[PDB]
Structure 1
Amino acid sequence: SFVKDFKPQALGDTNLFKPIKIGNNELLHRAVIPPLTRMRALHPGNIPNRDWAVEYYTQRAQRPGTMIITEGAFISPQAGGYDNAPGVWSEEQMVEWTKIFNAIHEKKSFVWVQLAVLGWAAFPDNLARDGLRYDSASDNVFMDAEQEAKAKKANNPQHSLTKDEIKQYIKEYVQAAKNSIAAGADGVEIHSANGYLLNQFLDPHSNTRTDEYGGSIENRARFTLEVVDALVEAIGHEKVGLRLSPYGVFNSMSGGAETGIVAQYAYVAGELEKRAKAGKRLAFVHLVEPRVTNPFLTEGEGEYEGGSNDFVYSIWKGPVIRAGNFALHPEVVREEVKDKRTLIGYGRFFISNPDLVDRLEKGLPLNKYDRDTFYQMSAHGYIDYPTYEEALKLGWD
């Protein structure tokens, strides 16, 4: 059914419906599909779902000129640890990704692969089964008690990465980016948000290292910036974006409680602008808003009111995608898109509305989402959410 009490607003008269160029892509509107893990990939081999994934992305590519960022994709087996999330390291995987990218392009839309590395968010037992380490920045602080225990039971204690192991990850990032572009993707997004590996290095709670990769703002940012630089060299700045969540607490990141958090992220933005001014500007910076500090809490919950991402705009001068509880708040979007380099990512409501862009333009009701099927091995709650036309025919009005 449709969301009750929601009062839609037509946003067609705003910059949300003004074209913009991101990297090589001429977007026709500024409603972006942010990365959304769905767990339909099949085991073994972390293979994008052979039955449904093409259809899922085809549905959500239906509005011409839409920018789609894929679900997170593991750069290597060591970067993984969830059996049902996809990778981008193997030929078997790329066969399916190629079909997905082709389908998106047939609809005249665009696709950027998010490159994922779990660190302490991985399941230590899956990794142990596969002969892999359980990795993070440090070895004396853990995501939670349950993960620490899981790791110990599996004889796979949380491991603080050596410099060589960091270089190996960078090698894998480079190859994954190459794989993505060769298979037809328009670009890649480096995930450095939401408490996964790169975020675990950025955050002083999770990073207690005393070498060059921790112990200061510059040191904590080192790994993220090394990945940025490696990918810019490999496939070009116009094919690379970076995702950050300064105020996120998901996966045991610090958020606003850490008084140094804005400085940490301001430094990263500054380093990106420095590179931009020296001729290598990333295609975009993607920010999760303090509106959503944990994406598994219902909209309105876990909102941090003590911080704003606006600081980034004083530093980074390129496009900014902002995501977090915007679907239910057209009044907020109307104000944010007055800034002419701002795009809006819509996550949960793109899960439930394949034709979300039409609905935003025209001020239509939104399909309610079913959180139970966010992660599920099913077509149900994946490819059977109706368009507005289909919903009317089903009598949802």
Structure 2
Amino acid sequence: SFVKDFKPQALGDTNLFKPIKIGNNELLHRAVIPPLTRMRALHPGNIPNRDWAVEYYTQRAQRPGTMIITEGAFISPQAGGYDNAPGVWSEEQMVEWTKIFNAIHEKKSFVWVQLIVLGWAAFPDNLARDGLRYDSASDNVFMDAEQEAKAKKANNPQHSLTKDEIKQYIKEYVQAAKNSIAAGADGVEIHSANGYLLNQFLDPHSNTRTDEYGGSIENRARFTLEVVDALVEAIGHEKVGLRLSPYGVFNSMSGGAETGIVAQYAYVAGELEKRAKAGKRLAFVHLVEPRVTNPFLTEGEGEYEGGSNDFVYSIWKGPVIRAGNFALHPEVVREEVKDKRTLIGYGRFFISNPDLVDRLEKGLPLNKYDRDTFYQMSAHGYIDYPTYEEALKLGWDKK
């Protein structure tokens, strides 16, 4: 069915429908697909779904000139810990990714691989089974009671990374980025948001290290910026973006309750702008909005009103993608896109609307999403959401 209490607005008369260049890609509009984990990858081997993933991405690439950021992809086995999320370290994985990239490109759209390392969000019991560590910045604070329980049962203790192990992850980021580009991707996004490993280093709650990787703003940002620099050198600044969620609390990050949080993220933004003036400007910075501090709460919940991401614009002078509860708020998007370097990521409603871009342009009703199939091993709630045409044929306008 369509979302019941929603008054659509056509956005075709706004900058959302003005072309913009991001890295090497000439986007034809500024509605971006942000990274969305769907858990259809197959075990063993963290292989992109051989039955459905091409179709899923093809559907969502249908509007020409759309920028798609993939679901997060593990850079290595040690970086993972969910059996049904994909990786980008193996030949068998890359064979499937290449088909996905080719399909997106045939629709004249673009694809950026999000590179992920889980840290304390990983399942310690899956990792123990595979003879892998359970990693984080520190070993004296733990994500939550369920993770604690899983770790006790699996007898797999949270492990504070050594400097050598940080370097090994950096090597893996580099190879994963190279694999992605060689397989046909337009670029990569470094995930430093949502409470995964890089965020665990940025955040003073999860990072209580006393070496050069913790204990100050500069030190907490070190790992993230090392990955940035390593990938810029490996594949080019124009093929690299960075994702941040300054106000996020998902996976036990501090958000606005930490009074130093703006400073921490302002520092990162400043260091990116320094590199940009020095000839190496990232393709984009991607921000999760305080509109959504936890993406598994229904739209309107988990809003933080005590802070804004606008500070980033005073510092970083490149493109900015913003995501978080924008689909149901065209009135907000209309204002935000007046800034000529702002793009809008639409997550949950791109799950449920393969033709979302057409619907945004024309002010059409939106398909409701089905949270029960966000992570299911099924084609249902993955590739069977209808376009607007299909929805009308199905009688959804009278449901």
TM-score if structure 2 supplies the norm length? 0.99
CA deviations over 1:228-276 (Å, ceiling 9, x no partner): 0000000000000000000000000000000000000000000000000
Q: CA deviation at 1:145?
A: 2.0
CA deviations over 1:331-359 (Å, ceiling 9, x no partner): 00000000000000000000000000000
Whole-angstrom CA distance in 1 between matches of 2:118 and 2:112:
19
- Residue aligning to 1:40: 40
Whole-angstrom CA distance in 1 between matches of 2:160 and 2:154:
17
Whole-angstrom CA distance in 2 between matches of 1:45 and 1:116:
16
Whole-angstrom CA distance in 1 between matches of 2:298 and 2:148:
27
Find runs of 4+ consecutive structure 1 residues off by over 6 angstroms: none
Whole-angstrom CA distance in 2 between matches of 1:130 and 1:376:
23
Q: CA deviation at 1:157?
A: 0.1
Q: CA deviation at 1:277?
A: 0.2
Q: CA deviation at 1:5?
A: 1.4
Structure 2 regions of 5+ residues with no counterpart? none
Whole-angstrom CA distance in 1 between matches of 2:272 and 2:378:
40
Whole-angstrom CA distance in 1 between matches of 2:60 and 2:206:
36
CA deviations over 1:84-116 (Å, ceiling 9, x no partner): 000000000000000000000000000000000
Whole-angstrom CA distance in 1 between matches of 2:340 and 2:149:
48
Whole-angstrom CA distance in 2 between matches of 1:59 and 1:130:
35
Whole-angstrom CA distance in 1 between matches of 2:150 and 2:183:
36
CA deviations over 1:53-74 (Å, ceiling 9, x no partner): 0000000000000000000000
Whole-angstrom CA distance in 1 between matches of 2:229 and 2:142:
29
- Tell me, what secondary structure is at the counterpart of 2:350? helix
Whole-angstrom CA distance in 2 between matches of 1:147 and 1:386:
37
Q: CA deviation at 1:151?
A: 1.3
Whole-angstrom CA distance in 2 between matches of 1:72 and 1:352:
18
- Tell me, what secondary structure is at the counterpart of 2:113? strand
Whole-angstrom CA distance in 1 between matches of 2:396 and 2:146:
42
CA deviations over 1:27-65 (Å, ceiling 9, x no partner): 000000000000000000000000000000000000000
Structure 1 regions of 5+ residues with no counterpart? none
Whole-angstrom CA distance in 2 between matches of 1:110 and 1:275:
25
- 1:23 equivalenced with 2:19 (yes/no): no
Q: CA deviation at 1:154?
A: 1.1
After TM superposition, list the pairs within 5 Å mapping 1:58-207 onto structure 2: 58-207=58-207
Whole-angstrom CA distance in 2 between matches of 1:145 and 1:56:
35
Q: CA deviation at 1:152?
A: 2.3
Whole-angstrom CA distance in 1 between matches of 2:171 and 2:274:
24
Whole-angstrom CA distance in 2 between matches of 1:189 and 1:121:
19
Q: CA deviation at 1:148?
A: 1.9
Whole-angstrom CA distance in 1 between matches of 2:106 and 2:137:
41
What's the Cα RMSD here?
Answer: 0.4
CA deviations over 1:177-203 (Å, ceiling 9, x no partner): 000000000000000000000000000
Identity %: 100
Of residues 242-251 and 142-151 in structure 1, the stretch that sits farther from structure 2 once superposed is 142-151
Whole-angstrom CA distance in 2 between matches of 1:150 and 1:245:
27
CA deviations over 1:349-387 (Å, ceiling 9, x no partner): 000000000000000000000000000000000000000
TM-score if structure 1 supplies the norm length? 1.00
Q: CA deviation at 1:147?
A: 1.0
Whole-angstrom CA distance in 1 between matches of 2:48 and 2:122:
19
